Amino acid sequence: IDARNLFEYHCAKCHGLTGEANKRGKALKAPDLCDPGWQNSKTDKEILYSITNGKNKMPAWNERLTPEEIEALARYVRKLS
Ligand code: HEC
Ligand SMILES: [Cl-]
């Protein structure tokens, strides 16, 4: 699975290509995925859950993405630090 490319289409809209949240993401109170501080405040089961189910006001991706695709993405979110 090409998790980078799934990410940049689906996700980079808010988190930015590098995972520093851009002005769209900042305005929605997005975190900086790229931040080691943030990365260390979450687990993988937490990340997988939030992509699958949505997080506070944010929608779930388990319609548009397969479980496989969500896992690759979770592993990709980790590669941004
Ligand atoms: C804006 C329109 C977003 C898009 C598109 C995606 N995400 Fe997101 N994400 C966004 C916000 C505003 C937040 C914070 C929500 C809050 O109230 O805390 C998040 C959060 C995440 C997280 C962290 C989840 C957690 O429980 O802390 C992750 C791992 C994450 N987002 C990843 C992610 C992926 C993989 C996306 C594409 C499939 C994606 N997000 C889309 C804003 C937006
Ligand atoms: Cl999309």
Residue numbers in the entry: 34 to 114
Q: What's the publication's text?
A:
Anaerobic ammonium oxidation (anammox) is a bacterial process in which ammonium and nitrite are combined into dinitrogen gas and water, yielding energy for the cell. As anammox bacteria express a large number of small c-type cytochromes, these have been proposed to perform the shuttling of electrons between the various parts of the metabolic machinery. Kustc0562 and Kustc0563 share 37% sequence identity after cleavage of the signal sequence and display a typical type-I cytochrome c fold.
In the crystal structure of Kustc0563, the heme iron is proximally coordinated by His47 and distally by Met91; in Kustc0562, the iron is proximally coordinated by the homologous His51, but the distal ligand is an imidazole molecule, presumably from the crystallization solution. Met94, the residue in Kustc0562 homologous to the distal Met in Kustc0563, has moved toward the side of the heme with the propionate groups to make space for imidazole, and a part of the loop containing this residue shows a different conformation than that in Kustc0563. The structures of Kustc0562 and Kustc0563 are highly similar, the main difference in the crystal structures being the presence of an axial imidazole ligand in the Kustc0562 structure, with an Fe–N distance of 2.1 Å. Given the high concentration of imidazole (100 mM) in the crystallization experiment, we believe this to be a crystallization artifact in which the “true” distal ligand, Met94, is displaced by imidazole. Indeed, when oxidized Kustc0562 was exposed in solution to the same concentration of imidazole as used in crystallization, a shift of the Soret band maximum from 411 to 406 nm accompanied by the disappearance of a charge-transfer band at 690 nm indicated a ligand exchange of methionine to imidazole. Spectropotentiometry revealed that Kustc0562 and Kustc0563 have redox potentials of +244 and +268 mV versus standard hydrogen electrode (SHE), respectively. The striking contrast in electrostatics around the interaction sites on Kustc0562 and Kustc0563 provides an attractive explanation for this difference.
